Amino acid sequence: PNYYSIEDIFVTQEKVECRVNTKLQRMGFLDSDDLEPGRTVNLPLWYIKELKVNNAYFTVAVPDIYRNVHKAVCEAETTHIELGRLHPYFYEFGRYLTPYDRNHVIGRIIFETLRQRVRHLLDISDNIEAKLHEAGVRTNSQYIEWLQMT
Amino acid sequence: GLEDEDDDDMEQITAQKVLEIIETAWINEMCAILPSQTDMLELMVSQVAHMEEQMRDLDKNDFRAVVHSMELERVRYIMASYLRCRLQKIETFTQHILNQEESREPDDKRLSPEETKFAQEFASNVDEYFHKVATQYMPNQQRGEAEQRIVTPNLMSHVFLKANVAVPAVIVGVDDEEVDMAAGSQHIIPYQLVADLIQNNQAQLI
Amino acid sequence: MDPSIIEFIGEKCMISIIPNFSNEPLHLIYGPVGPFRAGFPVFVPLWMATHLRKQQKCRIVPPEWMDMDILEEIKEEEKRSKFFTKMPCEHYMVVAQLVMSTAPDDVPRCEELRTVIKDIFDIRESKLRTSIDAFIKGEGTYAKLDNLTLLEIHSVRPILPYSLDHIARYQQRDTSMLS
Amino acid sequence: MFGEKAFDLLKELERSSQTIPAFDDDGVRQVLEEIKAIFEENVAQASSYNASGDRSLWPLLNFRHAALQRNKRCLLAYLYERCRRIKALRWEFGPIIPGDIKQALCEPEVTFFNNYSKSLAAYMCSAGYNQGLPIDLTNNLRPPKSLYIEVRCMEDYGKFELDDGEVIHLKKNSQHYLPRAQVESLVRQGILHHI
Amino acid sequence: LRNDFYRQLVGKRILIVVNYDIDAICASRILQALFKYDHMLYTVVPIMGVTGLKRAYGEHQGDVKYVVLVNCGGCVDIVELLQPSDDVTFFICDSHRPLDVCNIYSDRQVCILGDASLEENIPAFETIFYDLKQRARRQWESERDRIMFEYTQFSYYGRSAALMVFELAWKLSKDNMDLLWWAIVGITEQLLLGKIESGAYTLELEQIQSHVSRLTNKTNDQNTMSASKITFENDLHLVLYRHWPVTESMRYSRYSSCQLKLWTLRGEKRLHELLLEMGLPLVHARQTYGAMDLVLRKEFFSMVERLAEKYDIADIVYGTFTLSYGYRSRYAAADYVYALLAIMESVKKHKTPEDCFLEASDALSRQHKQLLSAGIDQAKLLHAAVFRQVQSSLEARQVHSAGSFFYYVLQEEHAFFSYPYALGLLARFLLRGHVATSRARQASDLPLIASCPLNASEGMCLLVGIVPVREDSPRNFFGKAFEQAAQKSGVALLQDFFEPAVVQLRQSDLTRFLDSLTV
């Protein structure tokens, strides 16, 4: 039901600990029928992918690498910042996330990083870039024989 | 009644010309069904058969045997390629293409029957193999050919445009900026927006 | 996007060559061709010279852009190529392959030829890394074909567009941006 | 756990890459026998007045949906993934030479197999002629020569050659007085350095 | 003449490429090409012995009637062996030369490429296949003075395998300079008077010369890199001049070793005392020629040709060819044949022999040239593992005289020597050592016999034969000699190989075989 994904059990399952405005009832999986306003409440996404973002249950919040504290300088530090493989879904958290937290501020950032690649892969001669990267090597490797049988 | 065109008519549409008259229907299908014709099933199997029987007459030569043969081959790996592609296109797009077919019953221009026999072959294999995947206690409300399954609603094959039309800025249908057209240059786009010029074949593809 | 996709294409082009035997065991294949006479040149598509030069049958000399001075002048003509330049047949980088493969067993100077054309190919493609360092800001409606050739654009065809899609997810809402 | 297990399926194809001795149907068994067992997990409050349709089974209804979701699409894959490399060999041969094993056949996989073999039938009726010819697409594009000389190969295996021959022993030196009518089967599945 | 026959070759066919030889691929790869030239698909054979004949062909009981014969013919009245012939034509281009007249006639199923100024064997059909009794035997035996002088005295081989095909083909608008190199491969394969005689070598100084000293189809503009046509010069067939230093030749060469006695010391002092006269340095005498400085490398042969006149080696100047493709190299035709035998590797996989045959036939292409380097490597070490028995033998004297010949036995095998033809070489390296040199020639000029330890194949006493030297052209009694004990007793003997001079006994039934064979 998706622009599908390889890790459909790690696709919407990376976890965040948003606080709470109001009371709780019977979490089931957790140590739970009522808990506090404001708590480190572990929250693996999928159920809250469409769970009434406007409602008085949860608040403005971020896992703070995804907060401006890193990234809003990673747009100034967009020069030789490395990402490795770390927080992997980092071209793509916001493809869901960005409004859903409803801090109206970080839509620019991810684009601002990855539109850099219009001038990263001139010198080229995450879990998603892997495909196109392989392809970039491959097409030239076969353009090699587009010369000849070589 | 309306004869005397460069189609298979009362004249010679050259093997090297007939090479052209079907060439772009292949070269477009890369960078994206575009409207399909079963007419070639009358054309190619006929024309090549005539040369085939001529070669079946001229199966004694060394040379022209081989020339007609190499010709045939260079013609034939593309006629392979067409459905070598389209089977993928709708094996992929078995999902919601039937919406288009129940919208318009697309005529000889657009679709073809055997494609729509893939509807049979699809639902048969999928549901009768699913018959042993999850049918013991199969679904409760979304029990049929399911809701969520689609291959390609993205009309977004971002595409290079073969400029071969009016070298002045012939401004035409596209939902992004269309200013400043010409016979060489281009304003690159996706497929979503020009379903128009190539249904006209006004414009072209690289 | 392939090595022989072009060779399904470029050898379709036809040029005046020499045959050195006359019309074959059959006289003429019907089509644009006329029949064959030794010592009398004939224009044909180029996917026969395979079956002549490898068959030890006849020679061929090329078109005229396939020579020294014209290309030793286009080498400076493309100074204007801040878009593009002169285009002698727009496939001289593919034909030259199969030409210079077997033809130059008898042809004069297959080398300065080879030298300049490699000296022209990649250098026109350096344009295509550099001019891409001009490309910014979702410019779908900006591009360049004006005198592009045939053999190059495939070498970027597979990559950026299958990137630029899930860019183009972002290339209505409130003050913040949307995709 | 809830299906993290296609990550396990990736190594089922290991020797079976381009040197495939035989393949295996496994990784699935109780992985299937859980799924409608845990329909009970999915059915437990299903239309139950335990809560009369209220908050506490909305969030994991979605789980009941999620559990469904990951079920079906890996179940697309579990043969679709297998149908792709199939299709390569299965263009490399029509109904001349089906699978070397047919031993990891997910038992009604023939349902898809023949039907897939018969999706080509559409193409087949149109291919070759309007009535159709099962057409040469993948093999022996020698500019073909005379019919009756023997063979050499590069250690093909399976010995599934259904074409009109006495006994060829489809390996390197499958070599007997072999006509063309037999030898029209296979090319690049371990075979053709040479004739 | 096959100007009439060749044009029949359009139907189905087989291109056998016969039992083990370099001659095979030389005179066939030409035609593995030419088949797809006529739009003919080709089909080929690995052969190791007459063993292989019908265990391969018997799998192919058809009638494909355009058929090869090379390196065989001294086999059977070939209808009697190849009986499924009803009119199935054969085509012979065999070098296994001395053939019986049973095999030519019934002249439907063979083709006689035999024409010579030696008309001496006519009534053999009027004797054998035709034969009062007393006079019949009078004819029989008094003319077997000539007939049994054939096929019961000695044996030899003739002429090329595809120089005939060259003679056909230079007319057919084909100037495959590469294939002229291939011809030279076949030349120094066995036409080398060092191996088997030409004599007329000195008049093929004209032959292929006049083919190509004729022909420079670019006589005016020939200064390009690829496929520059080849050039004649008076050169050597000394051992592997090119990639190893001079001192390697000066050690591993026989025509020094037969005349200069190099494995000992005075050979070396004397060598130095000639490198004085050349005045070459010693570093420079121990770097690869391609590695040395230049003017010495350049001026080498210019001096060596002349002021080697005086020092017991008369016969170092020869006539040869050598070329490259471009800028990596300058190969030499003689710098290849000793590389050829390097993939003839007798490993215990059962895969090695035939697939190495395919490898070698994959080798003579310009496209396939990486591997040849490894062959050169192997050959050098082989040539220096020769010594691994020489000084240990020639000073220990394993030598056995054993009557009117000389007798040798090795009793421990080498993975080097699982491949057999080493057995010819070491004989032709060492009889020189003592049995020629520490004596006059009177105890030198007799042939020699060489045991072959089979440490791998269960013990079967493999063999090859040898001549006396400086009179080589007098054909080998060993063509017959070893039938002696075979004829007197016979002991588990086989002649399973194509060759006469090759046999296989039991590991431990060889001495009484000798005492029979002593005579």
PDB file of N, CA and C in Angstrom, chain D residues 140-154 166-168 172-178 180 193-195, chain E residues 10-14 32 35-36 38-46 55-57 59-64 354-355 358:
ATOM      1  N   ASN D 140      20.182 -19.571 -29.983  1.00  0.00           N
ATOM      2  CA  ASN D 140      20.784 -19.939 -31.266  1.00  0.00           C
ATOM      3  C   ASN D 140      20.518 -18.922 -32.372  1.00  0.00           C
ATOM      4  N   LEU D 141      20.967 -17.700 -32.117  1.00  0.00           N
ATOM      5  CA  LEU D 141      21.111 -16.692 -33.162  1.00  0.00           C
ATOM      6  C   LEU D 141      22.502 -16.685 -33.767  1.00  0.00           C
ATOM      7  N   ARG D 142      23.082 -17.869 -33.895  1.00  0.00           N
ATOM      8  CA  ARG D 142      23.908 -18.104 -35.059  1.00  0.00           C
ATOM      9  C   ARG D 142      23.092 -17.616 -36.239  1.00  0.00           C
ATOM     10  N   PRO D 143      23.647 -16.825 -37.145  1.00  0.00           N
ATOM     11  CA  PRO D 143      23.173 -16.935 -38.494  1.00  0.00           C
ATOM     12  C   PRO D 143      23.152 -18.417 -38.823  1.00  0.00           C
ATOM     13  N   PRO D 144      21.983 -19.068 -38.851  1.00  0.00           N
ATOM     14  CA  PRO D 144      21.965 -20.529 -38.683  1.00  0.00           C
ATOM     15  C   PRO D 144      22.601 -21.276 -39.846  1.00  0.00           C
ATOM     16  N   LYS D 145      23.301 -22.367 -39.522  1.00  0.00           N
ATOM     17  CA  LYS D 145      23.964 -23.215 -40.509  1.00  0.00           C
ATOM     18  C   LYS D 145      23.258 -24.576 -40.602  1.00  0.00           C
ATOM     19  N   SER D 146      23.830 -25.482 -41.412  1.00  0.00           N
ATOM     20  CA  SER D 146      23.252 -26.801 -41.683  1.00  0.00           C
ATOM     21  C   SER D 146      22.933 -27.585 -40.418  1.00  0.00           C
ATOM     22  N   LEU D 147      22.076 -28.596 -40.547  1.00  0.00           N
ATOM     23  CA  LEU D 147      21.348 -29.109 -39.396  1.00  0.00           C
ATOM     24  C   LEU D 147      22.105 -30.167 -38.607  1.00  0.00           C
ATOM     25  N   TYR D 148      22.936 -30.987 -39.251  1.00  0.00           N
ATOM     26  CA  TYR D 148      23.396 -32.242 -38.652  1.00  0.00           C
ATOM     27  C   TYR D 148      24.917 -32.253 -38.533  1.00  0.00           C
ATOM     28  N   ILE D 149      25.379 -31.697 -37.414  1.00  0.00           N
ATOM     29  CA  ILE D 149      26.724 -31.899 -36.892  1.00  0.00           C
ATOM     30  C   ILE D 149      26.537 -31.886 -35.376  1.00  0.00           C
ATOM     31  N   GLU D 150      27.473 -32.503 -34.663  1.00  0.00           N
ATOM     32  CA  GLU D 150      27.334 -32.737 -33.228  1.00  0.00           C
ATOM     33  C   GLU D 150      27.703 -31.466 -32.460  1.00  0.00           C
ATOM     34  N   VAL D 151      27.886 -31.585 -31.138  1.00  0.00           N
ATOM     35  CA  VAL D 151      27.858 -30.436 -30.242  1.00  0.00           C
ATOM     36  C   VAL D 151      29.017 -30.459 -29.250  1.00  0.00           C
ATOM     37  N   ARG D 152      29.321 -29.277 -28.701  1.00  0.00           N
ATOM     38  CA  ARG D 152      30.153 -29.133 -27.513  1.00  0.00           C
ATOM     39  C   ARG D 152      29.544 -28.024 -26.672  1.00  0.00           C
ATOM     40  N   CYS D 153      29.700 -28.133 -25.359  1.00  0.00           N
ATOM     41  CA  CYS D 153      29.135 -27.155 -24.444  1.00  0.00           C
ATOM     42  C   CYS D 153      30.147 -26.871 -23.347  1.00  0.00           C
ATOM     43  N   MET D 154      29.668 -26.246 -22.276  1.00  0.00           N
ATOM     44  CA  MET D 154      30.467 -25.817 -21.140  1.00  0.00           C
ATOM     45  C   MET D 154      29.836 -26.268 -19.840  1.00  0.00           C
ATOM     46  N   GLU D 166      17.997 -38.325 -29.596  1.00  0.00           N
ATOM     47  CA  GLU D 166      18.093 -39.694 -29.095  1.00  0.00           C
ATOM     48  C   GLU D 166      18.468 -39.670 -27.614  1.00  0.00           C
ATOM     49  N   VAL D 167      19.708 -39.271 -27.312  1.00  0.00           N
ATOM     50  CA  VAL D 167      20.169 -38.900 -25.977  1.00  0.00           C
ATOM     51  C   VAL D 167      21.343 -37.958 -26.224  1.00  0.00           C
ATOM     52  N   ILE D 168      21.296 -36.740 -25.667  1.00  0.00           N
ATOM     53  CA  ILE D 168      22.399 -35.791 -25.838  1.00  0.00           C
ATOM     54  C   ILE D 168      23.285 -35.654 -24.602  1.00  0.00           C
ATOM     55  N   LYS D 172      28.854 -30.183 -21.366  1.00  0.00           N
ATOM     56  CA  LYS D 172      29.972 -30.090 -22.282  1.00  0.00           C
ATOM     57  C   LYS D 172      30.214 -31.470 -22.851  1.00  0.00           C
ATOM     58  N   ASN D 173      30.370 -31.530 -24.166  1.00  0.00           N
ATOM     59  CA  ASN D 173      30.400 -32.794 -24.875  1.00  0.00           C
ATOM     60  C   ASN D 173      29.101 -33.564 -24.624  1.00  0.00           C
ATOM     61  N   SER D 174      27.982 -32.895 -24.927  1.00  0.00           N
ATOM     62  CA  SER D 174      26.685 -33.548 -25.076  1.00  0.00           C
ATOM     63  C   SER D 174      26.588 -34.136 -26.476  1.00  0.00           C
ATOM     64  N   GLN D 175      27.629 -34.834 -26.898  1.00  0.00           N
ATOM     65  CA  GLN D 175      28.041 -34.845 -28.295  1.00  0.00           C
ATOM     66  C   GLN D 175      27.631 -36.148 -28.962  1.00  0.00           C
ATOM     67  N   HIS D 176      26.590 -36.074 -29.780  1.00  0.00           N
ATOM     68  CA  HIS D 176      26.123 -37.194 -30.574  1.00  0.00           C
ATOM     69  C   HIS D 176      25.616 -36.629 -31.882  1.00  0.00           C
ATOM     70  N   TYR D 177      25.210 -37.510 -32.790  1.00  0.00           N
ATOM     71  CA  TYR D 177      24.798 -37.016 -34.090  1.00  0.00           C
ATOM     72  C   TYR D 177      23.509 -36.233 -33.886  1.00  0.00           C
ATOM     73  N   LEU D 178      23.678 -34.944 -33.572  1.00  0.00           N
ATOM     74  CA  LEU D 178      22.602 -34.085 -33.112  1.00  0.00           C
ATOM     75  C   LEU D 178      22.146 -33.161 -34.231  1.00  0.00           C
ATOM     76  N   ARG D 180      19.788 -29.919 -35.827  1.00  0.00           N
ATOM     77  CA  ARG D 180      19.403 -28.605 -35.326  1.00  0.00           C
ATOM     78  C   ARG D 180      18.098 -28.684 -34.558  1.00  0.00           C
ATOM     79  N   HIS D 193      30.559 -21.733 -24.788  1.00  0.00           N
ATOM     80  CA  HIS D 193      31.856 -21.400 -25.379  1.00  0.00           C
ATOM     81  C   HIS D 193      31.943 -21.735 -26.879  1.00  0.00           C
ATOM     82  N   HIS D 194      31.251 -22.774 -27.370  1.00  0.00           N
ATOM     83  CA  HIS D 194      31.738 -23.479 -28.555  1.00  0.00           C
ATOM     84  C   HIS D 194      30.661 -24.387 -29.142  1.00  0.00           C
ATOM     85  N   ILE D 195      30.807 -24.676 -30.442  1.00  0.00           N
ATOM     86  CA  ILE D 195      30.180 -25.829 -31.093  1.00  0.00           C
ATOM     87  C   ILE D 195      31.250 -26.779 -31.599  1.00  0.00           C
TER      88      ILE D 195
ATOM     89  N   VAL E  10      30.267 -27.052 -48.566  1.00  0.00           N
ATOM     90  CA  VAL E  10      29.216 -26.126 -48.161  1.00  0.00           C
ATOM     91  C   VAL E  10      28.271 -26.852 -47.206  1.00  0.00           C
ATOM     92  N   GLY E  11      28.010 -28.127 -47.474  1.00  0.00           N
ATOM     93  CA  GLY E  11      27.164 -28.928 -46.611  1.00  0.00           C
ATOM     94  C   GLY E  11      27.708 -29.125 -45.212  1.00  0.00           C
ATOM     95  N   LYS E  12      27.099 -30.038 -44.461  1.00  0.00           N
ATOM     96  CA  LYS E  12      27.562 -30.291 -43.112  1.00  0.00           C
ATOM     97  C   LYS E  12      28.962 -30.894 -43.149  1.00  0.00           C
ATOM     98  N   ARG E  13      29.607 -30.900 -41.991  1.00  0.00           N
ATOM     99  CA  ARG E  13      31.051 -31.048 -41.942  1.00  0.00           C
ATOM    100  C   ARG E  13      31.468 -31.418 -40.531  1.00  0.00           C
ATOM    101  N   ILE E  14      32.744 -31.750 -40.398  1.00  0.00           N
ATOM    102  CA  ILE E  14      33.447 -31.702 -39.125  1.00  0.00           C
ATOM    103  C   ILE E  14      34.846 -31.221 -39.412  1.00  0.00           C
ATOM    104  N   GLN E  32      38.621 -22.728 -38.398  1.00  0.00           N
ATOM    105  CA  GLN E  32      37.569 -22.420 -37.447  1.00  0.00           C
ATOM    106  C   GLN E  32      37.032 -21.025 -37.714  1.00  0.00           C
ATOM    107  N   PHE E  35      35.228 -21.305 -41.588  1.00  0.00           N
ATOM    108  CA  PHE E  35      33.915 -21.926 -41.614  1.00  0.00           C
ATOM    109  C   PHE E  35      32.822 -20.884 -41.477  1.00  0.00           C
ATOM    110  N   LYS E  36      32.911 -20.024 -40.465  1.00  0.00           N
ATOM    111  CA  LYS E  36      31.974 -18.911 -40.416  1.00  0.00           C
ATOM    112  C   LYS E  36      32.222 -17.911 -41.539  1.00  0.00           C
ATOM    113  N   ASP E  38      32.496 -18.987 -44.785  1.00  0.00           N
ATOM    114  CA  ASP E  38      31.525 -19.524 -45.731  1.00  0.00           C
ATOM    115  C   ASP E  38      30.141 -19.665 -45.110  1.00  0.00           C
ATOM    116  N   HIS E  39      29.931 -19.115 -43.913  1.00  0.00           N
ATOM    117  CA  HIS E  39      28.727 -19.343 -43.125  1.00  0.00           C
ATOM    118  C   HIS E  39      28.548 -20.840 -42.901  1.00  0.00           C
ATOM    119  N   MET E  40      29.548 -21.394 -42.231  1.00  0.00           N
ATOM    120  CA  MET E  40      29.640 -22.795 -41.868  1.00  0.00           C
ATOM    121  C   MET E  40      29.904 -22.848 -40.374  1.00  0.00           C
ATOM    122  N   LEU E  41      29.163 -23.679 -39.648  1.00  0.00           N
ATOM    123  CA  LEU E  41      29.448 -23.848 -38.232  1.00  0.00           C
ATOM    124  C   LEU E  41      30.385 -25.025 -38.095  1.00  0.00           C
ATOM    125  N   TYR E  42      31.242 -24.930 -37.101  1.00  0.00           N
ATOM    126  CA  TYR E  42      32.449 -25.722 -37.038  1.00  0.00           C
ATOM    127  C   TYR E  42      32.309 -26.656 -35.852  1.00  0.00           C
ATOM    128  N   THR E  43      33.038 -27.759 -35.903  1.00  0.00           N
ATOM    129  CA  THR E  43      32.947 -28.722 -34.825  1.00  0.00           C
ATOM    130  C   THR E  43      34.224 -29.520 -34.713  1.00  0.00           C
ATOM    131  N   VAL E  44      34.725 -29.619 -33.488  1.00  0.00           N
ATOM    132  CA  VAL E  44      36.111 -29.920 -33.240  1.00  0.00           C
ATOM    133  C   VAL E  44      36.192 -31.005 -32.178  1.00  0.00           C
ATOM    134  N   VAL E  45      37.412 -31.461 -31.939  1.00  0.00           N
ATOM    135  CA  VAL E  45      37.681 -32.750 -31.334  1.00  0.00           C
ATOM    136  C   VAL E  45      38.881 -32.554 -30.416  1.00  0.00           C
ATOM    137  N   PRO E  46      38.831 -32.977 -29.162  1.00  0.00           N
ATOM    138  CA  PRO E  46      40.083 -33.265 -28.459  1.00  0.00           C
ATOM    139  C   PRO E  46      40.483 -34.714 -28.634  1.00  0.00           C
ATOM    140  N   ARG E  55      35.766 -43.784 -29.592  1.00  0.00           N
ATOM    141  CA  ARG E  55      35.036 -43.402 -28.389  1.00  0.00           C
ATOM    142  C   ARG E  55      34.497 -41.990 -28.507  1.00  0.00           C
ATOM    143  N   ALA E  56      35.064 -41.192 -29.406  1.00  0.00           N
ATOM    144  CA  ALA E  56      34.499 -39.907 -29.769  1.00  0.00           C
ATOM    145  C   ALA E  56      33.594 -40.029 -30.995  1.00  0.00           C
ATOM    146  N   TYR E  57      34.110 -40.606 -32.088  1.00  0.00           N
ATOM    147  CA  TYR E  57      33.311 -40.696 -33.307  1.00  0.00           C
ATOM    148  C   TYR E  57      32.172 -41.680 -33.137  1.00  0.00           C
ATOM    149  N   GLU E  59      30.284 -41.930 -30.767  1.00  0.00           N
ATOM    150  CA  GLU E  59      29.161 -41.150 -30.266  1.00  0.00           C
ATOM    151  C   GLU E  59      28.393 -40.435 -31.370  1.00  0.00           C
ATOM    152  N   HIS E  60      29.001 -40.273 -32.539  1.00  0.00           N
ATOM    153  CA  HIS E  60      28.499 -39.482 -33.654  1.00  0.00           C
ATOM    154  C   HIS E  60      28.235 -40.308 -34.893  1.00  0.00           C
ATOM    155  N   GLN E  61      27.569 -41.440 -34.743  1.00  0.00           N
ATOM    156  CA  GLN E  61      27.335 -42.285 -35.902  1.00  0.00           C
ATOM    157  C   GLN E  61      26.322 -41.589 -36.805  1.00  0.00           C
ATOM    158  N   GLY E  62      26.833 -40.677 -37.627  1.00  0.00           N
ATOM    159  CA  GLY E  62      26.055 -40.081 -38.692  1.00  0.00           C
ATOM    160  C   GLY E  62      26.661 -40.395 -40.039  1.00  0.00           C
ATOM    161  N   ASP E  63      26.587 -39.430 -40.958  1.00  0.00           N
ATOM    162  CA  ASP E  63      27.176 -39.559 -42.285  1.00  0.00           C
ATOM    163  C   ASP E  63      27.824 -38.257 -42.722  1.00  0.00           C
ATOM    164  N   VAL E  64      28.187 -37.390 -41.781  1.00  0.00           N
ATOM    165  CA  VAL E  64      28.722 -36.089 -42.156  1.00  0.00           C
ATOM    166  C   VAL E  64      30.047 -36.321 -42.866  1.00  0.00           C
ATOM    167  N   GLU E 354      42.375 -31.584 -21.799  1.00  0.00           N
ATOM    168  CA  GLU E 354      41.480 -31.096 -22.841  1.00  0.00           C
ATOM    169  C   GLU E 354      41.233 -29.603 -22.687  1.00  0.00           C
ATOM    170  N   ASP E 355      40.956 -29.157 -21.466  1.00  0.00           N
ATOM    171  CA  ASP E 355      40.647 -27.747 -21.284  1.00  0.00           C
ATOM    172  C   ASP E 355      41.875 -26.885 -21.521  1.00  0.00           C
ATOM    173  N   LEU E 358      41.841 -26.376 -25.116  1.00  0.00           N
ATOM    174  CA  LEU E 358      40.971 -25.250 -25.436  1.00  0.00           C
ATOM    175  C   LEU E 358      41.643 -23.929 -25.102  1.00  0.00           C
TER     176      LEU E 358
END
